[PDB]
């Protein structure tokens, strides 16, 4: 997008977007080897990157209102502020402790944390 | 004036910073070094000479070039009075500083 | 020449500082009645160098302002002259357009027919007899004769610097002064919190 | 701590050239 | 998707480390030998 | 000159206006379609000659056949009809050249689309002319400062050479050219003619909105006063996109032949090739591989070979070209990219992976190269660039081992850290060109190993802070590096002393 620049949009918005792209690109550069052989021989920092990239890739997905009949779950509308905060906290490592399934088809980070916290609570 | 007149000014501050060990002492030395560099900042921009006749000749509004010249000339005369500043700074300065020097 | 004043002032501050051995004599006299050493030199030399380099910077600032004002004036004058000539050209174009209208356009078509028959009679066509060029020249010569009066009136006619035109230059000078003066030093930020420093900055002016 | 006293003193004598410029430049308006 | 570049980088890096150490050893041993 | 005297000269000039008309052979259009007109008659017409239709739009006579003539319409062909008249002007395609072009926006033919006013010029140059011979040229020995650290140090560009900015979409190709134009602005403001570089930007097959934003950016930085923009947008006819690069190059030859220096930036030449392919296929010419005509290589070569460094006998002028090439999926093995690489001197490869990993400008130093080499760089530059290149190669080699081996030696760890600091230093924002002398200081701090102290995340801000500190406190040093163009030993020592000192004073993260 041409609109993605520090002057047009907030500098915070730009840093978060670039961080996500850098995280995803780093993970994408490792998918071949991880496919051939597991992540065990992978470094500790690279394994953290892999875990965090899975979380973010899952969190990117969101249910739509028009797609409500297909999935059967209510759609979500995410304000820009909530979106940036969610991804900022995720890059910082807020939801790393929880499982990646809690981020699937969630509107905002708080929704994913509540589901993840309930899963931690159930056991 | 430009070269070599600031070397001694650096050795003095270097020793003073070497004496400082505590973080606060190191920070005070940083403040001191900033002040010294600010005062000793050299300026070299090749002040250009003005040919008022060339401007007066080529084109200008009647009386404008000469008025600019006389006003510019009047201001160039003014200059710092280093004598007055030197005496006050050499006479007395920061009695609190003098207290520190007593011991 | 400013460097000359720089070196002269430089020695003056040095001599005043050199006086400082005089104070020690005064102390000796007081002691007789009774019955870090480099800090002074570094401080003295720094202020002298500071004043010298600062004097040079101010000289550049004044000459630069004096030069920019005159250059900006010249640019405005060229624009004024260009606008006057552009007005002249627009009158010429309007004369052609008016000629396209009625009001003595018959001779133009008649003259064109004569010139056109000539061109047909010849291999090529040249507008030696077209009335458009003399017609345009007549208007332009009238305007030229009108402007050609004497250099005196041209002094203002050529360069009609409007009050707002000169006002803009004057506002730049005042703004330049405020920018040069209000420009405050940029040292360590969270370290210059002493009351005297903040006071000096607030009253920088 | 000696550096702290020196800093205060040296800072006391700042603004001299700035005030000098104010006078010299407030002297006349170039225009 | 480039596994060939991965192997090439891996190969180059490991060779450099091992043979950099060997170069250190070789300079020391020959220096000891050249001095006498 | 008095206003009255000037007006008299103007009146006299208006007086001496000549206008001759001669019998011009005309033909009829046998057919018209897709912008191609088959014309009957119109004999004694020269190949490449311009022709004029009834409405007033021009055409270029490319195909001379025994039966008819194949003309390409330089515009919209809706008004053209069978049996219409086609008048031969008698002159090969040409464009107005001069200094008044600067600060304007033209089309391929040279008509101004700014809306400011008519073009006040008297010189018209032929678009297609034989390139300079072997004798007129001269060795390239002057730097063309782009303002990009990575480029000015690793891939130096010399005035008179041809560098190819090749990459995929959205990799920062246009950004490099814009940054180059901005850097030139300082020289024009200061009265140093020996370094002024007129910038020409040829936009081929681009949405007018993009060019408008670019012109606004140039005006914002006041860099438009010395720039010329030639526009052949997507809506424009294919022949216009085909002639725009050649039109711009002729405008540059003006400066070249007149002892001046000009930088011409051809936006994607792949788009020019597409337009030429279209214009040729519609002419029924046999297609080559990927449907491109057989002589597409000749198209680009004849264009780019124009750029040269004329000898001192002719004025020492120079024309520097920065053609842009867009690749589909990073395959530089394609037909058009392959040809252009063989034509130019060096190529700057832009990679998408590097772009998203934070490496912006996304320049692949491993592939990028310049024939001129250090012959263009300044003395102070070459010294640092050699060590910088050697450091970069070592860092790339050890990157893979660290990820999997997960064990780092003291010597390797230092080299690994040093390379990382440099890569962070080479990063640069957009619309932020750096002076060459400031580059030397920053690159100096890097290669000497000082940057290894502070954390990587702080290297970029140290650059800004340290550059400001130098500009304020140490201005004579910068003037020496600039005027002399060399990094003396005294400057080395002075710089080597203040760098570590500043790192320790300012508030940074010192732990490596
Ligand atoms: N040095 C840079 N630093 C940060 N961002 C950059 C930098 N350079 C480019 N970008 C970003 O790259 C995008 C545009 O890249 P650019 O248009 O210059 O390359 P391009 O090859 O011309 O793309 P296209 O094929 O669409 O024309 C923008 O989003 C810009 O913000
Ligand atoms: Mg582009």
Numbering used by the authors:
A (entry chain E1): 374 to 496
B (entry chain d): 29 to 131
C (entry chain b): 27 to 61, 211 to 380
D (entry chain s): 115 to 145
E (entry chain i1): 28 to 63
F (entry chain A1): 34 to 545
From the paper:
The F-type ATP synthase (F1Fo-ATP synthase) is responsible for generating most of the cellular adenosine triphosphate (ATP) from adenosine diphosphate (ADP) and inorganic phosphate through rotary catalysis. In eukaryotes, ATP synthases are found in the inner mitochondrial membrane. In this study, we present the cryo-EM structures of the type III ATP synthase dimer and tetramer with associated lipids from the model organism Tetrahymena thermophila in complex with the natural inhibitor IF1.
Using masked refinements, the resolution of different regions reached 2.5–3.1 Å, allowing de novo modelling. Both monomers are inhibited in the same rotary state by the natural inhibitor IF1. In our structure, the canonical inhibitory helix of IF1 is bound to the βDP-subunit of the F1-subcomplex. It is connected to the C-terminus dimerization domain through a flexible (unmodeled) linker. Subunit-b contributes its N-terminal helix to the peripheral stalk structure, in addition to the canonical C-terminal helix.
